[PDB]
């Protein structure tokens, strides 16, 4: 009966692939032939945030488009006032091996996690005046790779044990566990209505989940290596991926297939971070060749290079109003671009 | 021109600057050792005299050591191995009595060859080009009791020396250091662990002293 189940799975894979082929009446390149190009995007470094003394692994913007948190391997979580380059807080972490950091949309909490398999939640607005631990989320067996806040009580984490988990901060227990990936999950990004979230793993597959019922809605394939980065479109109807095979790919949640491939011949280095603009016209990607390309998301042409880092661009963030782009990197520097 | 609140915020940021600088100055004089090895290869038998990542902190000859254990990480290794790029040295533990045993996960596979494959991946990784490796070859008493009963030729078919302790031990020692590609860039220090106290930590201290001297030679421009 095991061979019959494998045959049924293969038949369903063929059904999925020719259903995807059936709706592929035209590509994204044919529709956007007559639109105007964005021209040369020239962005200068407006601020430089110095203070970290190790490789910066992740940053997250605030929803006020001014505060930002950043994590690095020296055991310090630092909140920056990006307008004046002032350091509001400096959180000393118990474990210096962090790979992700989150900033709550209300602003009262930050999160971090990494090789200690623990998501630590820090309370910012404290009556005592210092930032303290509020809840340590233990449950994963693999390293935490990415985590985003839903609100002040719900946080979803992607881990290195091929699982995504939805947590309740007050109780400290996980409510929904998302299982389906075979490779280690590296990044997740959440929809603007916070009802769905995509998830990229090391098995070159992107899976669209549902936060409520906790089942995988769709699975997206088209990559050949470890997907390291993922980000929704601003409307929530599309998302982009970044992997080690030096390409970025745009998917559609409704057509359930590939839309556009972002790659060039001289680029042979993987992508560590992706982000969109406010309108979604520009797709920005952080590569390993020390640079950051700006892609026309509708025409798949490079539009500009944010060349200003002396090491690998590990993280990338865009403000909610689209004013600025922050590029952290392994050379202990955060740079604000505009 | 700043406000009074803005000036006090800048003063708070400068105090945060000096605290970060003194914390970094305390962290800069810290020996970071990444411990590696295979399962049941004597990984945990050297931390007694010297989930997630387990960090061991200890002092020897007024020098503080950070020793990191990543043996509990069952995930894919290359996604997090670049986090240990700036370590001083890598401690590698290989069991001497593991030349004639089969992996439980995969049949017809020696753990000596699996540890050799792990050493080949670690030593010749692109993140660890300059980092020296302190190779520990442990459980020599069981190896001495086992080499008389079991020959070494079932592990290495090309072995032609006698079945004595010293010749076979030196043979497999050279069979570990011949894997290094960049012999010039990195050194491989080799110790056979003993049940007597403070020998292993003395070897680690001498090896990291040599590594620190070589790094000072690199920074001063002599090498």
């Amino acid at each position: 009966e095991l061979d019959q189940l494998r045959q049924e799975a293969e038949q369903l894979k063929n059904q999925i692939r020719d259903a995807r082929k059936a709706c592929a009446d035209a590509t994204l390149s044919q529709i956007t032939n007559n639109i105007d190009p964005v021209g040369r995007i020239q962005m200068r470094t407006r601020r430089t945030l110095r203070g970290h003394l190790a490789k910066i692994y992740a940053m997250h913007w605030g929803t006020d488009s001014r505060l930002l948190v950043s994590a690095s391997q020296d055991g310090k979580l630092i909140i920056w006032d990006s307008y004046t380059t002032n350091k509001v807080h400096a959180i000393p972490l118990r474990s210096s091996w962090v790979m992700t950091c989150a900033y709550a949309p209300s602003g009262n909490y930050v999160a971090c996690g990494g090789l200690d398999n623990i998501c630590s939640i820090y309370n910012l607005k404290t009556r005592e005046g210092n930032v303290r631990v509020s809840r340590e989320l233990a449950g994963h067996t693999g390293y935490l790779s990415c985590c985003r806040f839903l609100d002040d009580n719900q946080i979803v984490t992607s881990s290195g044990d091929t699982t995504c988990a939805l947590w309740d901060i007050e109780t400290g227990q996980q409510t929904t566990t998302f299982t389906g990936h075979t490779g280690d999950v590296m990044s997740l990004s959440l929809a603007p209505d916070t009802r769905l979230f995509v998830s990229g793993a090391c098995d070159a597959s992107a899976k669209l989940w549902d936060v409520r019922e906790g089942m995988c809605r769709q699975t997206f394939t088209g990559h050949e290596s470890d997907i390291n980065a993922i980000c929704f479109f601003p409307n929530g109807n599309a998302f982009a991926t970044g992997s080690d095979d030096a390409t970025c790919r745009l998917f559609d949640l409704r057509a359930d297939q590939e839309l556009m491939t972002y790659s060039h011949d001289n680029i042979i280095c993987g992508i560590t971070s992706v982000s969109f603009s406010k309108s979604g016209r520009l797709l920005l990607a952080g590569y390993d060749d020390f640079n950051c390309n700006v892609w026309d998301a509708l025409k798949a042409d490079r539009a500009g290079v944010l060349a200003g880092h002396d090491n690998r661009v590990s993280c990338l963030g865009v403000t909610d109003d689209g004013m600025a782009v922050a590029t952290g990197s392994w050379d202990s520097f955060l740079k604000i671009w505009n | 021109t700043l406000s009074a609140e803005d000036k006090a915020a800048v003063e708070r940021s400068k105090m945060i600057d000096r605290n970060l600088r003194e914390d970094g100055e305390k962290a800069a004089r810290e020996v970071k050792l990444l411990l590696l090895g295979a399962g049941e290869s004597g990984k945990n038998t050297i931390v007694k005299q010297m989930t997630g990542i387990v960090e061991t902190h200890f002092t020897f000859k007024d020098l503080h050591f950070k020793m990191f254990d990543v043996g509990a990480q069952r995930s894919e290794r290359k996604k997090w191995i670049h986090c240990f790029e700036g370590v001083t040295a890598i401690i590698f533990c290989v069991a001497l009595s593991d030349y004639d045993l089969v992996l439980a996960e995969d049949e017809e596979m020696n753990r000596m060859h699996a540890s050799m494959k792990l050493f080949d991946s670690i030593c010749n990784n692109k993140w660890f080009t300059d980092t020296s490796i302190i190779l520990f070859l442990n459980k020599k008493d069981l190896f001495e009791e086992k080499i008389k009963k079991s020959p070494l030729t079932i592990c290495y078919p090309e072995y032609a020396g006698s079945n004595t302790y010293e010749e076979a031990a030196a043979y497999i020692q050279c069979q570990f250091e011949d894997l290094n590609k960049r012999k010039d860039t990195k050194e491989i220090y080799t110790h056979f662990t003993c049940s007597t106290d403070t020998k292993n930590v003395q070897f680690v201290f001498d090896a990291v002293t040599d590594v620190i001297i070589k790094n000072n030679l690199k920074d001063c421009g002599l090498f």
Epitope: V88 | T1, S3, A4, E5
Partner: single-chain antibody, 234 residues
């Protein structure tokens, strides 16, 4: 809980010396810049001295400059105020005030319990037009403050601070930076302004809300309070 206990005050001769001590508990004292605010038995609040976090920046009022000195002891969590050549104008009530400064912080959030003392030109002037308003509960009372110059800075912040002193205890912070409501204060209190003209809109006035209301400015040192608008029943 955050607690500031003050001691050392009492009866002194004119021209004498007396040392004030504000004991701190329940908060990280080393990261808070402390103040001293003086209140006469008949008059309102008056700022005296300020020491920054880490004792880096120290200011004084023009009345008490040179005579008073302010020091803090972060390991034992004590704020000091050594007084020399005391005169009859220093016969008043003293408060140590907690304050912190970063982006979005709430300075002057907590006030000390208070100790009393008995002795045997370019500044911004905060003018409150009314000194006493008879008001019933359940009504919407507006309290206004005026400024000599515009409190609106180029960064967009209007540094206006509202305080309420209930009869019997320390003043408490209600509104910080003109429009932001404080923590632990009800939502009824509302504040707004326009650079020079300010107002505080209290709606559905309760009974515990009576007391003396003060305005203050943080745009430039020295810190000048208001005259004091008092709310009473009927």
């Amino acid at each position: 809980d955050v607690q500031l206990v003050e001691s050392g005050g009492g009866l002194v001769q004119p021209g004498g010396s007396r040392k004030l001590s504000c004991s701190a508990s329940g908060f990280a004292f080393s990261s808070f810049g402390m103040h001293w605010v003086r209140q006469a038995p008949e008059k309102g609040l008056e700022w005296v001295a300020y020491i920054s976090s880490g004792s880096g920046t120290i200011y004084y009022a023009d009345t008490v400059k040179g005579r008073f000195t302010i020091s803090r002891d972060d390991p034992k969590n004590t704020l000091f105020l050594q007084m020399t050549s005391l005169r009859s104008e220093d016969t008043a009530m003293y408060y140590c005030v907690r304050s912190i400064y970063y982006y979005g912080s709430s300075p002057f959030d907590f006030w000390g319990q208070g100790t009393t003392l008995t002795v045997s030109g370019s500044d911004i002037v905060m003018t409150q037009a009314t000194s006493s308003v008879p008001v019933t509960p359940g009504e919407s009372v507006s309290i206004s403050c005026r400024s000599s110059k515009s409190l609106l800075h180029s960064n967009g912040n209007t540094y206006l601070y509202w305080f309420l002193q209930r009869p019997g205890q320390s003043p408490q912070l209600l509104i910080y930076r003109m429009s932001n409501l404080a923590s632990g204060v009800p939502d009824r209190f509302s504040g707004s302004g326009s650079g020079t003209a300010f107002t505080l809109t209290i709606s559905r006035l309760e009974a515990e809300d009576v007391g003396v209301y003060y305005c203050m400015q943080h745009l430039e040192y020295p810190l000048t309070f208001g005259a004091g608008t008092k709310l009473e029943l009927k």
